[PDB]
Amino acid sequence: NPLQKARILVNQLEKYLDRYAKEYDVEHLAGPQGHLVMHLYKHPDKDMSIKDAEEILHISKSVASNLVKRMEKNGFIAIVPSKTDKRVKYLYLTHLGKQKATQFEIFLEKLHSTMLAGITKEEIRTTKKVIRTLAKNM
Amino acid sequence: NPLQKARILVNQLEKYLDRYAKEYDVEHLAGPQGHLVMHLYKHPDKDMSIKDAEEILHISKSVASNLVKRMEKNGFIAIVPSKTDKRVKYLYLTHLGKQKATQFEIFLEKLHSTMLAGITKEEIRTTKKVIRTLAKNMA
Numbered sequence: 001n002p003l004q005k006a007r008i009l010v011n012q013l014e015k016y017l018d019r020y021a022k023e024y025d026v027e028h029l030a031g032p033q034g035h036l037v038m039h040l041y042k043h044p045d046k047d048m049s050i051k052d053a054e055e056i057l058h059i060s061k062s063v064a065s066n067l068v069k070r071m072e073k074n075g076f077i078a079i080v081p082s083k084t085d086k087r088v089k090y091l092y093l094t095h096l097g098k099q100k101a102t103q104f105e106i107f108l109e110k111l112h113s114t115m116l117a118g119i120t121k122e123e124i125r126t127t128k129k130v131i132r133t134l135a136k137n138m
Numbered sequence: 139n140p141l142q143k144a145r146i147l148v149n150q151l152e153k154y155l156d157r158y159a160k161e162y163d164v165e166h167l168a169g170p171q172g173h174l175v176m177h178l179y180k181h182p183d184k185d186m187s188i189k190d191a192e193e194i195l196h197i198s199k200s201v202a203s204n205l206v207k208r209m210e211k212n213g214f215i216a217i218v219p220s221k222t223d224k225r226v227k228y229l230y231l232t233h234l235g236k237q238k239a240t241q242f243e244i245f246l247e248k249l250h251s252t253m254l255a256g257i258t259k260e261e262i263r264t265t266k267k268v269i270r271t272l273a274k275n276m277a
Contacts, residue, residue, distance in 0.1 A: 001169055002266055003155060007148045009273050014141045016276040031139070118271045126261050127268040131147070133256045138150045 016115075024107035026100060032057055033071050034104050040077070040093045041101035048091040049082075076100065154253050162245035164238060170195050171209050172242045178215070178231040179239035186229045187220075214238060 021030040029037060036053055054064045068091055071077045076097040082088035093101060116124070159165040167175060177194055178186060186194075191202040206229060209215050214235040220226035231239070254262070 002269070003148055003152045005273070006269055007145070007152070009269055010141055010145050010148065012273060012276050017141075115272060115275050117275050119268055123264050123268050127265050130257055130261050130265045131144070134151065134253065135147055137253050137255050138147065138154070 020107060020111065024103060024110075026104050026107050028074065029076070029100050029104055030107075032059075032067055033074070033076065036067070036071065036091070037076060037093065037097055037101045038104060038108075040091060041098060041105075050089045050091070053091065071097075151253060155249075158245055158248050158252075162241045162248070164242045164245050166212055167214075167238060167242050167245075170197075170205055171212070171214060172238075174205070174209065174229070175214055175231065175235055175239050175242060178229065179236060182231075188217075188227050188229070191229065 017030065018027070021027040026034065035057060036048075039052075039056060040048055050061070050064055050068055053059075053068060054061060057064065057067075059067070068077065068079060068089070071091075072079050075094055078092045078094060080090045080092060082090065155168060156165070159168050164172065173195060174186075174191060188199065188202050188206060191197070191206060192199055195202065195205070197205065206215060206217055210217050213232060216230045216232055218228050218230060220228060
């Protein structure tokens, strides 16, 4: 049954991810914080406002604000408020965020090497398409 | 969390699945038995051996044999060994199985109408393949 197998896959997938994130020592960075840290490190000539994080992660301001607040508490970023507009805040990688970023690139590189073996990109775009239309149908 | 979200979706899909199988009274047919019944009902001029079932459902003789024995226990088919060949066993849709067929057709129509809207069958076949190969890769 496809639904029973998918339920099984999800559980294996969460276990598989926790195990690698530990092996690569990016366990707390795995997930949205990693996605933010990555974008920062990949685009050094741009600035990231908290609103940049909302649009990339399609989350709300309250959710994004507590996310960047978490990343600052973890020593991953410096939050620097804009001097012109008091409501705009910028995100900057610390030294630890830079090291963690570059380690996170390596961890993802192996995941795309292992988990997506034998899966073309056209198969992936459609799979994401099917899952979204199932979700919309619910 | 994307994984938390996928788990919730699959749980919604299964709940909606049970809802339609109850509605159309086809709960045991969701899956291979329904596929066999359909092949029987749709092709009434051919005969289906157990070895035919292996090819149709891409299963083993042992898996097909336990499948049809389950379908007979549910009264969907009669398994009648060949009167010519002692090694061939044939499958025949019963009266109950013919009613289940048309009940199963409307059920599939409802799935394609509601939960599986906008998803072609080729899109489903790839989705199943990605799921099989991702599971293989975490091993």
